[PDB]
Amino acid sequence: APQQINDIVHRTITPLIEQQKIPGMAVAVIYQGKPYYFTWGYADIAKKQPVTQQTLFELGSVSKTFTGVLGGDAIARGEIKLSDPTTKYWPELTAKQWNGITLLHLATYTAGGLPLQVPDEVKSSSDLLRFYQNWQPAWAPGTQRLYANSSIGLFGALAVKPSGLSFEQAMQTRVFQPLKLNHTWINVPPAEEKNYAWGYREGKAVHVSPGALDAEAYGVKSTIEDMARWVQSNLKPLDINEKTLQQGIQLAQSRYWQTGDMYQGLGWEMLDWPVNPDSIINGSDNKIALAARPVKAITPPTPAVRASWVHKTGATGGFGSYVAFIPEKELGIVMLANKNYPNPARVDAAWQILNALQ
Structure with a gap:
């Protein structure tokens, strides 16, 4: 890579x-539209397998960006409308509190307090x-x-109902395949297990556990190459x-709600660029990211703004991921690690790198 990119990435x-004692990491910087890859450490400590450009990492909540885009694709297909009440797609939801809650509310965490996690006892569709x-x-x-995972998770499940496809089939055929993300999975196939890194939590190797609406909210695994391609697709x-x-x-990049300096898209979150780094670095911390915040409706939603810092953080018990890009500058970055480490540190590093590249 150009020495400038090499140096800023390595020095950061x-x-x-x-400092974070991360066992393995992969980074992709998209510059003037082209990707540059970097890898360090181990995908599997016990088996001494290094991280490579083919290593699969758990994206955690970065998966919500795929869910948001698949939903947008369904809207574009005329299969659903964000203004549709939730009951149109789940008639069994007869409880009165659902009157007035639309797919837009589910997709943007504004339904009225749906919980962060779907309880572990929820297995079946009837549960x-x-x-x-x-x-x-x-x-x-x-x-x-x-x-809330239970909010956008239900949005993902309902958005694919008209297609008659399972969420996974819809995602593979409508998003992964068209974009040639051939090493991106909701369920890792046996043939690809050789590439699946282990996550590390308190020194123990771990993988994400199955859970209700996991595919829709935090279940995608991908490589640094496919994630760079995902960033290029969202950039252009x-x-x-x-x-x-x-x-x-x-x-998915339209601005639906505003809370402070942040705008909520479908999966993606955005801020105007140039951004105040303290506005996003600090904002990333679960202290602010997961808090209850009043929102102002953007009526009607603002179409995707090119001069935006668009991003999403994500974690699983053993992984920490981050993606951010600036359309106007054809610049982006993906950081995948097999240790969940503080969100602020992720944003600080991304900002230092992207700011340095203009």
């Missing part, structure tokens, strides 16, 4: 790895129905944002040949 990531029927909102719909949706997917990507 090396210290990070040492899931019971959970949503019995849930009592703390707030009226569209008034407060509370980051007009290059995408499949019409509804090009549109879906744009809808």
Whole structure:
């Protein structure tokens, strides 16, 4: 890579790895549209397997960006509308608190306090129905944002109903395949297990556990190469040949709600660029990212703004990931690690690198 990129990436990531004691890491910087890869350490400590450009990492909540885009694609296909009430797709949700909660509320965590996690006892579809029927909102719909896997997770599940495809089939055929993300998976196949890194939590090798709506909220695994391609696709949706997917990507970056300096998209979150780094580095900390925040509706939503810092953080028990890009500058970065480490450290590093590249 150009020495400038090499130096800023190495001078930023090396210290990070040492300070956070990250076992393995892969980074992709997209510059002027082209990707540059970097890898360090181990994908599997016990078996001494190094991280490579083919290593699969658990994306955790970065998976929500795929869910948001698949939803946008369904909207573009005319299969669903964000203004549709949730009950249109799950008639069994007859409890009165659901009157007024639309797919937009689910996709943007504004339904009124749906919980962060779907309880572990929820297995079956009937367990899931019971959970949503019995849930009592703390707030009226569209008034407060509370980051929640049970919110966007239900959005993902309902968004694919009309297609008659399973969430996984829809994601593979409508998003992964068209974008040639051939090493991106919701369920890692046996043939690819050789590439699946282990996550590390308190020194122990771990993988994410199965859970209700896991695919929709935090279940994607991918390589640094496929994630770089995912960033390029979101940076330049007009290059995408499949019409509804090009549109879906744009809808995922539309600004639906504003809370402080942040705007909520579908999966993606955005801020105006140039951004105040303290506004995002600090904002990333679960202290602010997962807090209850009043939201102002953007009526109507603002179409994707090129001068934006677009990003998403994600973690599983053993992995920490981060993606950020600036359309206007054709610049982006992906940081994948097999240790969940503080969000602020991720954002600080990404900002240092991207700011240095203009």
